[PDB]
Design a protein around this nucleic acid. Structure first.
Ligand SMILES: [Mg+2]
Ligand SMILES: [Mg+2]
Ligand SMILES: [Mg+2]
Lengths: 76, 195, 149, 129, 188, 72
RNA sequence: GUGCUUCCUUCAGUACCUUAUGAGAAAUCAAAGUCUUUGGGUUCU
RNA sequence: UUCAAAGAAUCAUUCUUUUUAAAAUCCGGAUUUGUUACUUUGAGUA
C-alpha cells in the first residue's frame, strides 16, 4: 500500500510526501539562562547571547553541538 | 496455540539462516546481534494451519506427494506419508516424474509438498509443467519460485524440519475426523526425527 | 548536472506547512530590518538567508514575510545591479582567467573556463530576457574583472 | 528531461500492469493526466486513485483492476480532423469493437467514439486496450 | 445603539443575534480577551444543518481585511466563546472574492493567483479548521466519477469533546461553500 | 464457447497451454476445526508463480476472505 | 564495540552474481528491457 | 490560473436542462469578456 505508509521515514528525503530531516532546537548552554534557538544542520556557527561562545560546531551534516549542553526540539 | 509455539522453540524453527531473501522479509521478525534471522513464528503457525487445510481439501489423500532429498528429512516424510495417505518420495527425485508419461515411476499428484526449494528445486521446477500447487517448508534464504505456500521454518536443522512435519500431520489429522480436538495427538516427535 | 556527468540530488526540501510555525515570535518588520542590515553588511541573498536561518530563529523569510528576500531587498532598494548567481559565475571566470594569464599550460583549467563562460552566457541571456540585466551587456573577458564590484 | 509528464505516467502504468502490481505511484500529476485517468476509470480499466497533494507537482497513486492490456501516449499530438480519425484508429487500436483513442478536443478530452458523436476531432493524446 | 453596525447587512435572524453576542462578550470580558469585538465586524452568516440526529452550524462571512488583521490572531478564543454562548458550532471564514481568469476586470490586468478559484478554496479550507492546521490534502477519485477530498489535521484537536462532530460540521460547511465532498481525519 | 479462467490474484486470465498456473483449493472448517464439506478456491497464473509473488498474492487473497489474518 | 570502529538506512559513484510469461538472430543484455500491445525528447550514422 | 454541483429521459451507461463568482451593457430582471495555432461549421470554387 503506497498511500498509507507507516515506518518508512527511513526512506530518502524523497518519501511519499517530502519532509525535511532537519528540525529546530530550543537550546541552552550550562548557565547562560535562556532559550537560544537553533537549526540542526546549521552551517555557520551560532554564538549565544551573552558570552559569545561556540554553541554549534559546524560540520558536513547535523552540527556537532558543543560540550554537554541540552536541547529540546522546537516541536510543531 | 502456545503449546505448538513452545514445541517449535524447543526444536529450532524460530532461527532461520543468514541471507534473508527480500520476499521472505515479511515472515522474518527481526535479525539478531549474532548474524541470524528470527522467523515470526505466529506466521509460521498460521501458514502451517493454512497448508494443512489445503492438504485436507484434496479429495483422496494418496495423490499428494511429499519430498525431501535431504537424508534427515526423508524419515520424517516417510512418517508423514504413513500417517496421512500421501506418497513420500524420499531421497533421489527423478527428473521425469511429473512430466514423462512413459517412465515407470510416473505418478502425477494434485499437491506437491517440498521440504526445501533450495535443494529439492528440481521437484519444484517440475511442479510448473503439470500445474501442481506446491507448499514449501522453506527457510529464510530460500527461493520461492513456483511455490504457492511458503511455510517459514528452517531446513538446515533436521530436528526442526521433523517437528514441522509432525505439526503439519497433526493439523491434517485434526482437520479430518480421526483425532478429535482437545485431545493431544498420541504419537511423538523423535518418532519423526532422524535417528 | 548541466555540465559534468554529475547526477547527484542533494537538495533543500521545504516542509509541507508554509504558514509560519507556532514558535516563531519575530514580527515581520523586525525580520525585514534584520535582512536589510545583513544586506548592508555585504552579504548576498543566499548568504543572508543562511544567516537568518542560523543566527536568528527563522526558517523561511517567505513564511514570516509574504515576500521572498530578494524581493524585499529590491523594495528597500539595496538590490545588486548584477544578480547573485551570475555575479558569482563572473567572479569564478575572472579567477580562472587570472590563473590562465599566470600559468599558460593549464589545459583542464582552460576547458573549465570555457564551460563557465558558456554558463555565464546562458545565465546572462536569461537575465537579459527578463530585465535584471540591461540589453547592452555582453560580458567581456577584458572587462569582466571590473564588472563584479 | 521530462517533456511529456503524461507519457511517462502512462508508461509507468503499463509497466505496473505488466508486473501485476495493484498500486502504482504516478509521480508528477498533471491536470491532463488526471483527466485521462478519470476517462479510463469511466470506461472501467482503472480503479480508484488518490491524487496526493504535496505542495508541488502532486503524486498520484492509482489502484489497478488487472484489466489494462496496454495504455499509451501517441506523441506528436497530431491535430486530427473528424474524417481523418477512422484511419488513425484502424492503425492504432486492436479492434473496432474495443479500445479507446483519446483526443483532447475543444469539448474537453474524450475518446474517438465520443468525438464522432459530438462532431469535433482534435489533438490525439493516447489510447488503451 | 451599535449591534446593527457590527454586521454589514440588513439584520436577518441570526446575524443580529451573533452581533449581540459579540457585544455582550465585549462588555463582559469573558475567559481572557477584552475589547476584541471593537475590532471585529462581519459581512454575513449562514446557518446549515448536517446528516445528524440534530445540530445546526454557522458560517460567519468576515470582511477579508478584518480577518487578516484581528480574527486570524485570536480565533481559538473567539470560536470557543461563541460555542459556549450559542451551542450551534461556528466557523469564521473570510469573504474573499473569486475571479475568472479570462475576463478583464477594470482592476488588475491579469488576475492575481490569490483570487483564483482553487487558491481561494484552499484558503477557505485553511480558515475553516483553525483550532488545528492541515497536515495533508489528498483527493480520492472514487471509481464512480466522484471526488472526495480526504483532509487530515494535526494533533491538538484530539483533546476536545466535539472532535468527530466538529469534523462533520467542517465537511458540511465546505460542501456548502464549494459543492465539494470532503472528509476529515487525524493521525493515531 | 469456453470462457477461460481469470487468475484470482492479478486477473490476467490464463490459456490452455499455460500449465504452471494452478487452481489451489482451501478446505473449510466448521466450528470444531473438522473439515467442512465446502472448499474456497483461488486460481493463480503462471507469471506470478514464476516471479515468486505467488505466496504474497495468496496471503492477500486469504486476507480478503477470512481464511488467514495478517495481509502483508 | 573501543573521538574512531562496526552494524542499519539512505544518497551519488561503481562493479559482480542469480533471475527473467522481459528482450534478442543468437552470443548474450537490469539495459541490448517497458518494440507489429510499434510515437517521452533529441543529435548523429 | 473555474474545479465542480444538481434535476429529467434511456438500457452501470447515453443525450438534454439548470446554477456557481467578477466587470461592462439594458428596463430587482436581461445580455458581452485576451491573440494565434488547433478544431467545427460554412461560404466560394470549371
Ligand atoms: Mg548539455
Ligand atoms: Mg535526476
Ligand atoms: Mg519503431
Amino acid at each position: 500500500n503506497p498511500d498509507p505508509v507507516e515506518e518508512s521515514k527511513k526512506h530518502k528525503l524523497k518519501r511519499l510526501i517530502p519532509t525535511p530531516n532537519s528540525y529546530f532546537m530550543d537550546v541552552k548552554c550550562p548557565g547562560c539562562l535562556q532559550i537560544t534557538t537553533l537549526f540542526s544542520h546549521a552551517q555557520n556557527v551560532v554564538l549565544c547571547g551573552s558570552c559569545n561562545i561556540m554553541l554549534c560546531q559546524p560540520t558536513g551534516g547535523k552540527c556537532k553541538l558543543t560540550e554537554g549542553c541540552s536541547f529540546r526540539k522546537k516541536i510543531e | 496455540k502456545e503449546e505448538s509455539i513452545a514445541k517449535m522453540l524447543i526444536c529450532k524453527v524460530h532461527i532461520g539462516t543468514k541471507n534473508l531473501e527480500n520476499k521472505m522479509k515479511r515472515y522474518v521478525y527481526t535479525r539478531a546481534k549474532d548474524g541470524v534471522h528470527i522467523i515470526n513464528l505466529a506466521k509460521t503457525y498460521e501458514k502451517l494451519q493454512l497448508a494443512a487445510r489445503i492438504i485436507v481439501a484434496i479429495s483422496n489423500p494418496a495423490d499428494v506427494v511429499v519430498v525431501s532429498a535431504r537424508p534427515f528429512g526423508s524419515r520424517a516424510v516417510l512418517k508423514f506419508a504413513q500417517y496421512t495417505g500421501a506418497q513420500a518420495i524420499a531421497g533421489r527425485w527423478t527428473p521425469g516424474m511429473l512430466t514423462n508419461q512413459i517412465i515407470q515411476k510416473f505418478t502425477e499428484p494434485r499437491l506437491l509438498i517440498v521440504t526445501d526449494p533450495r535443494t529439492d528445486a528440481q521437484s519444484v521446477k517440475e511442479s510448473a509443467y503439470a500445474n501442481i500447487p506446491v507448499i514449501a517448508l522453506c527457510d529464510s534464504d530460500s527461493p520461492l519460485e513456483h511455490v504457492d505456500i511458503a511455510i517459514p521454518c528452517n531446513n538446515k536443522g533436521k530436528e526442526s524440519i521433523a517437528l514441522m512435519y509432525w505439526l503439519l500431520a497433526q493439523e491434517v489429522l485434526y482437520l479430518k475426523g480421526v483425532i478429535p480436538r482437545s485431545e493431544p495427538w498420541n504419537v511423538m516427535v523423535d518418532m519423526f526425527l532422524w535417528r | 548536472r548541466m555540465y559534468g556527468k554529475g547526477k547527484g540530488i542533494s537538495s533543500s526540501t521545504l516542509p509541507y506547512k508554509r504558514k509560519q510555525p507556532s514558535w516563531l515570535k519575530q514580527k515581520p518588520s523586525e525580520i525585514e530590518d534584520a535582512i536589510i542590515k545583513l544586506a548592508k553588511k555585504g552579504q548576498t541573498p543566499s548568504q543572508i538567508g543562511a544567516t537568518l536561518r542560523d543566527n536568528y530563529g527563522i526558517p523561511q523569510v517567505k513564511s514570516v514575510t509574504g515576500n521572498k528576500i530578494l524581493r524585499i531587498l529590491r523594495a528597500q532598494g539595496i538590490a545588486t545591479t548584477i544578480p547573485e548567481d551570475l555575479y558569482f559565475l563572473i567572479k569564478k571566470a575572472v579567477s580562472m582567467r587570472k590563473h590562465l594569464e599566470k600559468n599558460k599550460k593549464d589545459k583542464d583549467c582552460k576547458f573549465r573556463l570555457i564551460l563557465t563562460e558558456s554558463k555565464i552566457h546562458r545565465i546572462s541571456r536569461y537575465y537579459k530576457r527578463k530585465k535584471l540585466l540591461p540589453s547592452n551587456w555582453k560580458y567581456q573577458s577584458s572587462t569582466a574583472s571590473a564588472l563584479i564590484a | 528531461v521530462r517533456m511529456s509528464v503524461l507519457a511517462d505516467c502512462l508508461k509507468t502504468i503499463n509497466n505496473a500492469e505488466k508486473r501485476g502490481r495493484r498500486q502504482v505511484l504516478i509521480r508528477p500529476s498533471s491536470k491532463v493526466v488526471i483527466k485521462f485517468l478519470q476517462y479510463m476509470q469511466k470506461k472501467g480499466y482503472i480503479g480508484s486513485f488518490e491524487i496526493v497533494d504535496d505542495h508541488r507537482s502532486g503524486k498520484i497513486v492509482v489502484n489497478l483492476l488487472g484489466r489494462i492490456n496496454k495504455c499509451a501516449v501517441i506523441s506528436p499530438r497530431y491535430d486530427v480532423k473528424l474524417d481523418e480519425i477512422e484511419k488513425i484508429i484502424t492503425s492504432i487500436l486492436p479492434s473496432r469493437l474495443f479500445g479507446h483513442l483519446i483526443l483532447t478536443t475543444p469539448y474537453g478530452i474524450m475518446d474517438h467514439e465520443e468525438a464522432r458523436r459530438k462532431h469535433t476531432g482534435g489533438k490525439v493524446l493516447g489510447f488503451f486496450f | 445603539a451599535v449591534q446593527k453596525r457590527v454586521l454589514k447587512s440588513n439584520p436577518s435572524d441570526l446575524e443580529k443575534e451573533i452581533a449581540q453576542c459579540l457585544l455582550d462578550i465585549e462588555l463582559s470580558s469573558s475567559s481572557d480577551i477584552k475589547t476584541d469585538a471593537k475590532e471585529i465586524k462581519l459581512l454575513s452568516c449562514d446557518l446549515i444543518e448536517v446528516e445528524k440526529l440534530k445540530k445546526k452550524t454557522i458560517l460567519i462571512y468576515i470582511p477579508y481585511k478584518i480577518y487578516t488583521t484581528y480574527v486570524r490572531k485570536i480565533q481559538r478564543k473567539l470560536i470557543n466563546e461563541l460555542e459556549k454562548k450559542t451551542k450551534k458550532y461556528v466557523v469564521l471564514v473570510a469573504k474573499r472574492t473569486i475571479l475568472k481568469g479570462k475576463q478583464k476586470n477594470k482592476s488588475f490586468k491579469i488576475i492575481p493567483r490569490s483570487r483564483t478559484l482553487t487558491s481561494v478554496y484552499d484558503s477557505i479550507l485553511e480558515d475553516i479548521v483553525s483550532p488545528s492546521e492541515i497536515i495533508g490534502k489528498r483527493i480520492s477519485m472514487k471509481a464512480d466519477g466522484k471526488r472526495v477530498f480526504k483532509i487530515m489535521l494535526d494533533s491538538k484537536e484530539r483533546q476536545r469533546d466535539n472532535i468527530e462532530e466538529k469534523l462533520i460540521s467542517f465537511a458540511a460547511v465546505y460542501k456548502k461553500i464549494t459543492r465539494r465532498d470532503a472528509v476529515f481525519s487525524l493521525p493515531p | 464457447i469456453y470462457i477461460p479462467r481469470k487468475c484470482s490474484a492479478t486477473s490476467r486470465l490464463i490459456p490452455a497451454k499455460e500449465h504452471g498456473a494452478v487452481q489451489i483449493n482451501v478446505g473449510m472448517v466448521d466450528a470444531n476445526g473438522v473439515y467442512n464439506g465446502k472448499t474456497e478456491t483461488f486460481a493463480i497464473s503462471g507469471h506470478v508463480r514464476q516471479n515468486g509473488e505467488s505466496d504474497a498474492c495468496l496471503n492477500r487473497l486469504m486476507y480478503e476472505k477470512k481464511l488467514l489474518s495478517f495481509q502483508n
